[PDB]
Write a protein that binds this ligand. Structure first.
Ligand SMILES: CCCCCCCCCCCCCCCCCC(=O)OC[C@H](COP(=O)([O-])OCC(O)COP(=O)([O-])OC[C@@H](COC(=O)CCCCCCCCCCCCCCCCC)OC(=O)CCCCCCCCCCCCCCCCC)OC(=O)CCCCCCCCCCCCCCCCC
Ligand SMILES: CCCCCCCCCCCCCCCCCC(=O)O[C@@H](COC(=O)CCCCCCCCCCCCCCC)COP(=O)(O)OC[C@H](O)CO
Ligand SMILES: CCCCCCCCCCCCCCCCCC(=O)O[C@@H](COC(=O)CCCCCCCCCCCCCCC)COP(=O)(O)OC[C@H](O)CO
Ligand SMILES: CCCCCCCCCCCCCCCCCCCC(=O)O[C@H](COC(=O)CCCCCCCCCCCCCC)COP(=O)(O)OCCN
Ligand SMILES: CCCCCCCCCCCCCCCCCCCC(=O)O[C@H](COC(=O)CCCCCCCCCCCCCC)COP(=O)(O)OCCN
Ligand SMILES: CCCCCCCCCCCCCCCCCC(=O)OC[C@H](COP(=O)(O)O)OC(=O)CCCCCCCCCCCCCCCCC
Ligand SMILES: CCCCCCCCCCCCCCCCCC(=O)OC[C@H](COP(=O)(O)O)OC(=O)CCCCCCCCCCCCCCCCC
Lengths: 70, 80, 494, 76, 48, 79, 90, 74
């Protein structure tokens, strides 16, 4: 009726504010431990080992020793 | 069946490498006619027939050759 | 040694322009709103034209620094500081000078309540950032970068929309200051060897492989916070969302570029052996950032949060490019830096157009806007395409050149980085279709206004620049090749 | 509908029936032809035909780049 | 007269002399590599 | 009939950039930002379009191309 | 002021650079880096010129390109191995 | 179109994103059987060994199998 401002819906705003405050809900559960162990440590390590091997495979393809890293 | 078209003639006529076989001395006139007649199918009929007969004979000779090899595969089998 | 340059238009006057504007505005009453607006706008526009002139007098054949001029701090002359640019920093000066008037124009309607403090803060930011990009000295690079924290803090805290701006500003200041202190530590370790902080000399000193490892880590700790690289990227969504529209434009378009500029300007040429040793590490961090942050972007429900997360994926692609250490890689990294500075700024401007009218960032409230705001819808679609690296747009040039540079070094990293083509499309098109397509929802929004003349004019130069870099990037790449080539070769003699 | 009559678009919106659309269409056609003239000139200048055609072709009237690439050893 | 020829001449007048720009660059380094010794001697002065 | 009977929109729907037209015979009043921005845009176009096409070509590619030609010539003609 | 004309540089590598100890004459080190960059661009421009020859031989010779372009193809592919800063070192 | 539903209950966490008669793993099993058809056809073609029953000898081009025309050493 009056105004360009959106007419707020209480449930939509509750949903949004719940999204903005997720860190208050973290519990070190079993599922969270597994998800952080798999995606926060293991997968980055696997990707790093892949990238390094790629360079080493290039190194041995060129008749050169393995390049040291890190 | 001996090669008639030279390398120079086949290069000058711009023959696709896979059509540089024993029948190219007939492909050259056929392609000249095909280009002159806008590749119409009712045109160039004599040239095309002669060239296709040549190609058919080439295939037939390679079929008879394979018929001879396959009757020696059996010779080996019945003597083993 | 006085290194005074022959050129009439030089760097010091371009530094002085917004300073003089700020001093003049200090003394004009807040009742004279029109005068304040015009003075700030004109100072910013004159600075932009000055930078354009600096582009014309630029010499694209030398590997040296240009317009080099000097700046003398003590009569003892032990410590004397130099300014100069090259083909890696020139376009960033131009981008800063171009974006600042845009910021003054975005807040034109609200200037009666914004006051002269808004314009003064943005002018001071402009002066500090141009200084930062123009410094041939580690220690002054440090001093001028930390200085921007104060006006940026004020900009976020005062003119942010809601009370979350408090936390956002605290986090911005503290993260950035922590990184800055790490790089101060690195600067002092360098000084203990060399006795100087002059960039030109450090480019001609030899560091031990060991001393290089430690110095590289201490530089990385600043720069990775600046880029941002995971996992120190979490300050960025909060800060870039809670800031006012022009504040977000400056944060995404300029301030984010300072970490990649620091990588290009000090870390890669000063410590080439460490740069080589850490390359797998950088590749891994950037690839993880691109995939994970793109997937997080996919699940965001706030307009500004979606645009802000997108910038993390783009900057980590930039890092992959620059650490590829070839022409395609570094050229693409610089081109993508500039293109991102245009595209993300335009996207923040689009979201700001929506927020100024409707005062919500939640995607669910919008929808069907094509039928009430077709001009905004068309412009928003164009910048959405640019954010997906659509060929023809400026971002595609940098993106593909970076993929070229990465593929020649490591095919796996290029393969992980090319996944961004799929994920960025997904979130960009989903955002656009949820905002603009569909039906209206009159129970949330029923009153609408398309763009006014000011908003259309604001968008025009962004469109022109995006198309211009997209179709003919030769104007930029020709001025950069000598500098990029000398950066790539530095440290080797074969 | 009802509100869409107050909404300006470049493509004209729904059921667009400008009163002078015939004259406007004619003006657009004249504009496209005028724009096409320089494009045609540039195309004729830029075209490269290394091979003489088997029969005469229309492009031979305006394009003078027939049989010019024979000495490809000197290309730069 | 012609716009562009004037513009050519004006742009060249704006630009650094490349020879002189590359020569002060050499004086800075030669003077700084050999000037980097004086200050470090003061830092080694005994306080006692 | 859609081709022989003229359309009904005497004036288009909407107003360009949602500004109501000025009173008949009057002119639209320019906002304060308009003239400085338009003059800046014109100067930007002029400066870039003239200076960029008027600046010497100093690119490393152009210098190396001429150097490459003469080295292939000096090596081809001589043995 | 810049005089009109293409940029001019010294044809020769700087006298004062020692490949054994390159961090000994800093000025010579910088000059050697710039000279190497310029030399590398001359090799890139040579490979680009050889590519124009292949492009046109393919186009002019059609189906005879395999036998006609052979020497040009060999020259171009040899110039492209260790060119610029791509997949080959020196 | 008609009247967009305005929520009257709290929204779930995964509401931004929210194939009817078949199950998930059952559909996977049916599709795997469909692709196993292609695998079985491929293995059958392997077992057929059609290459061993070709009814003509291989073609032989003149001029050393067009060695020079194919880019070989002249
Ligand atoms: C021989 C058996 C071997 C073990 C001997 C100990 C006896 C025993 O465990 O009971 C026997 C026990 C069961 O026999 P039983 O018939 O019940 O007899 C019970 C007795 O009468 C005994 O019954 P009881 O009730 O009298 O005694 C129970 C016993 C039971 O012994 C135990 O303590 C074992 C239980 C520990 C297992 C913990 C599992 C973790 C679960 C937690 C999950 C958290 C996840 C949450 C995630 C989020 C969720 C959403 O507890 C004790 O009194 C022992 C004290 C030891 C304390 C250890 C920790 C002290 C630190 C301070 C407290 C904690 C603070 C944190 C700091 C941590 C330390 C760094 O036998 C076994 O379980 C066999 C063990 C097999 C192990 C593998 C093979 C080992 C040999 C390897 C050789 C290679 C070389
Ligand atoms: C907070 C900084 C980390 C702890 C302090 C620290 O170790 O400071 C280093 C700060 O440098 C860094 O690497 C900072 C690390 C920041 C990451 C945390 C400087 O020591 P260094 O071991 O690098 O120098 C030794 C050198 O060989 C002597 O010349
Ligand atoms: C370079 C030349 C490219 C020429 C392409 C022409 C672009 C067409 C103009 C945009 C269309 C427009 O005005 O938006 C319409 C609608 O707006 C949109 O649909 C938004 C999407 C615009 C799509 C334009 C993109 C065209 C694709 C070309 C991409 C350019 C190439 C990219 C690389 C440079 C207007 O609404 P309407 O008249 O159809 O009526 C419907 C009204 O909304 C309610 O009834
Ligand atoms: C190769 C290793 C490289 C370095 C990685 C870090 C170090 C290694 C991992 C350390 C693990 C320590 C032991 C964890 C297991 C014991 C669990 C005991 C039970 C438990 O749940 O205790 C919780 C303790 O959590 C904790 O104390 C949290 C554990 C620490 C997590 C470390 C995460 C590292 C960063 C992740 C990746 C980030 C980057 C990703 C790109 C608190 O239970 P509670 O009862 O309070 O729970 C809320 C209930 N209301
Ligand atoms: C915050 C940002 C910090 C980033 C952490 C850097 C990740 C990689 C660390 C490399 C470790 C490393 O090379 O070990 C030593 C560096 O000193 C160190 O151990 C690193 C010192 C920095 C403090 C610890 C950084 C993480 C704590 C937060 C040198 O050892 P080396 O000579 O064997 O190197 C091998 C040369 N080929
Ligand atoms: C529809 C509009 C599309 C606009 C695109 C124009 C593209 C023209 C073709 C390019 C060309 O040949 O030019 C090379 C040409 C010289 O080419 P060269 O001889 O090969 O070096 O230079 C020009 O003519 C430049 C064009 C003059 C006007 C430029 C537009 C300025 C508008 C604002 C730009 C963005 C402002 C924001 C700040 C950016 C900071 C990073
Ligand atoms: C690799 C492993 C694939 C199986 C993984 C699923 C596991 C599972 O739970 O499945 C049990 C699956 C259902 O599991 P539930 O969802 O737990 O009941 O069992 C079934 O009821 C489905 C399996 C039987 C029906 C499919 C038989 C295959 C038909 C193929 C026909 C294709 C014709 C195409 C045209 C040819 C010409």
């Amino acid at each position: 009726g009056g105004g360009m401002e959106t007419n707020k819906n209480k449930f939509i705003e509750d949903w949004g504010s719940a999204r903005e405050n997720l860190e208050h809900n973290f519990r070190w559960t079993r599922r969270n431990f597994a998800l952080i162990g798999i995606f926060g440590i293991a997968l980055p390590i696997i990707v790093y080992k892949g990238i390094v091997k790629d360079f080493h495979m290039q190194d041995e393809d060129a008749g050169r020793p393995h390049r040291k890293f890190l | 069946k001996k090669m008639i078209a030279t390398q120079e003639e086949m290069s000058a006529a711009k023959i696709a490498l896979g059509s540089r076989d024993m029948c190219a001395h007939l492909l050259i006139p056929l392609n000249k006619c095909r280009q002159a007649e806008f590749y119409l199918p009712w045109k160039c009929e004599d040239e095309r027939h002669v060239y296709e007969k040549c190609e058919y004979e080439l295939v037939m000779e390679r079929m008879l050759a394979m018929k001879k090899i396959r009757e020696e595969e059996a010779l080996a089998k019945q003597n083993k | 040694l006085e290194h005074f340059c022959e050129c009439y238009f030089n760097l010091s006057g371009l530094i002085l322009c917004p300073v003089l504007g700020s001093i003049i505005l200090l003394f004009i009453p807040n009742s004279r709103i029109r005068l304040i607006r015009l003075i700030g706008l004109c100072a910013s526009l004159i600075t932009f034209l000055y930078s354009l002139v600096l582009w014309i007098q630029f010499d694209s054949s030398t590997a040296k620094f240009q317009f080099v001029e000097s700046l003398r701090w003590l009569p003892y002359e032990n410590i004397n500081f130099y300014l100069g640019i090259d083909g890696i920093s020139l376009f960033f000066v131009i981008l800063t000078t171009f974006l600042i008037p845009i910021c003054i124009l975005v807040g034109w309607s609200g200037m009666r309540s914004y006051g002269k403090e808004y314009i003064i803060a943005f002018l001071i930011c402009e002066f500090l950032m141009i200084a930062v990009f123009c410094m041939l000295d580690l220690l002054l690079f440090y001093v001028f970068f930390e200085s921007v924290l104060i006006p940026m803090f004020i900009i976020i805290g005062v003119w942010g929309s809601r009370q979350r701006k408090i936390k956002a500003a605290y986090q911005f200041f503290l993260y950035t200051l922590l990184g800055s202190l790490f790089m101060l530590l690195a600067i002092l370790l360098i000084l203990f060897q060399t006795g100087t902080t002059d960039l030109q000399i450090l480019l001609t000193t030899e560091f031990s492989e060991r001393r290089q490892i430690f110095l590289w880590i201490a530089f990385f700790a600043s720069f990775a916070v600046k880029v941002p690289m995971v996992p120190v990227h979490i300050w960025l969504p909060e800060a870039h969302v809670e800031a006012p529209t022009a504040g977000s434009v400056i944060l995404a378009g300029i301030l984010l570029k300072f970490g990649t500029y620091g990588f290009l300007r000090f870390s890669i040429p000063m410590f080439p052996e460490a740069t080589l040793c850490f390359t797998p590490f950088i590749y891994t961090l950037s690839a993880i950032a691109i995939i994970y942050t793109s997937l997080t972007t996919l699940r965001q429900i706030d307009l500004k949060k979606i645009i802000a997360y997108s910038s993390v994926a783009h900057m980590n692609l930039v890092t992959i490019g620059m650490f590829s250490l070839n022409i395609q890689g570094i050229g693409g990294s610089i081109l993508l830096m500039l293109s991102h500075g245009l595209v993300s700024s335009a996207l923040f401007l689009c979201v700001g157009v929506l927020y100024d009218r409707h005062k919500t960032r939640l995607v669910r409230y919008y929808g069907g806007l094509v039928s009430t705001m077709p001009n905004f819808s068309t412009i928003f679609f164009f910048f959405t395409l640019a954010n997906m690296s659509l060929p023809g747009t400026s971002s595609f040039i940098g993106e593909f050149l970076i993929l070229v540079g990465a593929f020649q070094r490591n095919s796996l990293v290029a393969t992980l980085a090319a996944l961004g083509m799929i994920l960025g499309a997904a979130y960009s098109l989903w955002l656009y279709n949820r905002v603009v397509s569909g039906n209206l929802k009159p129970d949330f929004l029923h009153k609408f206004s398309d763009l006014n003349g000011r908003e259309v004019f604001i968008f025009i130069p962004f469109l022109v620049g995006l198309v211009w870099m997209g179709v003919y990037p030769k104007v930029f790449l020709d001025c950069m090749h000598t500098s990029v080539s000398n950066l790539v070769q530095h440290g080797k003699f074969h | 509908g009802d509100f869409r009559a107050k909404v300006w678009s470049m493509t004209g919106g729904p059921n667009c029936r400008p009163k002078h659309w015939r004259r406007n269409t004619a003006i657009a056609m004249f504009g496209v032809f005028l724009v096409c003239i320089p494009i045609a000139k540039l195309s004729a200048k830029l075209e490269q035909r290394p091979h003489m055609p088997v029969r005469p072709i229309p492009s031979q009237i305006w394009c003078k780049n027939f049989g010019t690439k024979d000495d490809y050893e000197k290309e730069h | 007269g012609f716009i562009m020829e004037f513009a050519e001449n004006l742009v060249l007048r704006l630009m650094e002399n490349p020879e002189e720009r590359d020569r002060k660059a050499r004086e800075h380094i030669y003077e700084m590599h050999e000037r980097c010794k004086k200050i470090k001697e003061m830092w080694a002065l005994p306080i006692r | 009939s859609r081709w022989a009977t003229p359309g009904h929109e005497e004036r288009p729907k909407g107003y360009f950039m949602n500004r109501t037209p000025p009173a008949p015979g009057q002119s639209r009043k320019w906002e304060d930002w308009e003239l400085p921005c338009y003059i800046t845009s014109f100067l930007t176009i002029v400066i870039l379009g003239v200076g960029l096409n008027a600046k010497p070509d100093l690119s490393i590619e152009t210098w190396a191309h001429q150097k490459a030609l003469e080295r292939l010539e000096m090596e081809k003609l001589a043995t | 002021g810049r005089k009109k004309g293409l940029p001019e540089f010294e044809e020769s590598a700087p006298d004062g650079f020692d490949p054994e100890n390159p961090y000994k004459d800093p000025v010579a080190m910088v000059e050697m880096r710039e000279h190497i960059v310029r030399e590398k661009w001359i090799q890139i421009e040579k490979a680009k010129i050889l590519r124009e020859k292949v492009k046109w031989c393919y186009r002019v010779e059609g189906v005879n390109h395999y036998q006609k372009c052979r020497h040009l193809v060999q020259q171009y592919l040899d110039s492209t191995r260790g060119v610029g800063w791509g997949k080959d070192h020196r | 179109v008609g009247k967009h539903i305005v929520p009257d209950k709290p929204l779930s966490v995964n509401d931004e994103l929210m194939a009817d008669t078949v199950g998930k793993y059952e559909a996977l099993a049916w599709l795997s059987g469909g692709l196993g058809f292609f695998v079985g056809l491929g293995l059958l073609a392997v077992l057929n060994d059609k290459a061993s029953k070709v009814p003509f000898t291989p073609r032989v081009y003149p001029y050393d199998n067009l060695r020079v025309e194919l880019g070989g050493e002249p």
